[PDB]
Amino acid sequence: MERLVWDKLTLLGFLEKNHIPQKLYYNLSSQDKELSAEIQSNVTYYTLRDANNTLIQALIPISQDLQIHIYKKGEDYFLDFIPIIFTRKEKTLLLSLQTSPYQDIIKATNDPLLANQLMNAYKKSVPFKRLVKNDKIAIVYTRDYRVGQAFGQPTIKMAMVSSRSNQYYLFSHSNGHYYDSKAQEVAGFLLETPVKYTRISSPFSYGRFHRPHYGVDYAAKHGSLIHSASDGRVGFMGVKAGYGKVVEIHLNELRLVYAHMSAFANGLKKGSFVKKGQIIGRVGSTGPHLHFGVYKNSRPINPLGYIRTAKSKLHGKQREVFLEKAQRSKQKLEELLKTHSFEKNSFYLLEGFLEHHHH
Ligand code: NI
Ligand code: NI
Ligand SMILES: [Zn+2]
């Protein structure tokens, strides 16, 4: 297949451009239409054409693990939402600061995405802002690959920065949030419910085997006020097929989506800075509901996990398992730092983490 980069088309625009009957979109359920609205610009997608240059297949990612599959069978086109098959690689970055955290990470990885994730993860960290030459930064992270090619964003499993001989750790969890070594949340966001809803008509779902919905649908009256769940900056504001009128707001590594609006607030525009609690529009059905979506580092995440008044902590068996892994991870990081000298090199980018050792 040809590997290409998505630019500005909608699904419908893509169908039109390639002479695929547009009913393939119009016939979708409203849930599938919402799903189809999340094709991001710059995603890598795949196409296959026949001798006539007719589009006979396409694979278009809508998340890190779901994609649209369009294919011609006999005389007709079909559209499925299917899993993405991928390979995951783990690396360990070990770094002695030479210039700035950001520049050094780029030097060692050539990856702005990872560098931005670290800055964001430590955004409120006082020791982080006070890092100086020869302070240490370690990151254990994974990246996902499709036929050899990385896609989406990396995932930080563990990070550590040292300042004045003290080490400041954070760890990911399968729930998508970061935790310190006492299993309490760090680098969180306190989001507020953005509308007065009558009920949640459809919660967030990965749709995973034991259905995918990448937001929360809040049933509300047409015209109900919609308030920003957070501070941030408006990125997009307008109409997207499947979402109707929508506002997107960015804050650190979050993108927050508010869809199906009947109207935007007067004077709101692309680039507007907004405050948590500020009115950004009104509920519509462009019956009525607000679709509220949250994306961390490009990946959809359950918004409800961040609507809380306090910082989260892990509990029960989740806490036990976490702390066990955290201890093992900390011990292993020390061993790796002992066995890779910053006299020889300012950084090391190592294959794997727990299994990494020499002979
Ligand atoms: Ni090594
Ligand atoms: Ni061995
Ligand atoms: Zn929805």
Numbering used by the authors: 41 to 250, 257 to 332, 337 to 409
Task: Give the exact sentences the study uses for this entry.
Seven cell shape-determining genes (csd1, csd2, csd3/hdpA, ccmA, csd4, csd5 and csd6) have been identified in H. pylori. Among them, Csd3 (also known as HdpA) is a bifunctional enzyme. Its d,d-endopeptidase activity cleaves the d-Ala4-mDAP3 peptide bond between cross-linked muramyl tetrapeptides and pentapeptides.
Among these, only the N-terminally 41-residue truncated Csd3 (Csd3Δ41) comprised of residues 42–403 was expressed in soluble form, and it yielded two different forms (the orthorhombic form 1 and the hexagonal form 2) of well diffracting crystals. We have determined the structure of Csd3Δ41 using SAD data from a Pt-derivatized form 2 crystal. The form 2 crystal contains one monomer of Csd3Δ41 in the asymmetric unit. This model of Csd3Δ41 excludes six residues (Pro251–Arg256) in a disordered loop near the metal-binding site as well as four residues Gly333–Thr336 and two histidines at the end of the C-terminal affinity tag. In the form 1 crystal, the two monomers in the asymmetric unit bury a relatively large surface area of 1130 Å2 per monomer (6.0% of the monomer surface area), whereas the largest buried surface area in the form 2 crystal is 710 Å2 per monomer (3.8% of the monomer surface area). Loop I of Csd3 shows the most significant deviation among the homologues. In form 2 crystals, it is not involved in crystal packing and is disordered. Interestingly, the side chain of His339 of Csd3, the first histidine of the HxH motif, shows two different orientations. Its orientation in the form 2 crystals is similar to those in other homologous proteins. In both the form 1 and the form 2 crystals, domain 1 blocks the active-site cleft of the LytM domain, with the protruding helix α3 contributing to the Zn2+ coordination sphere.
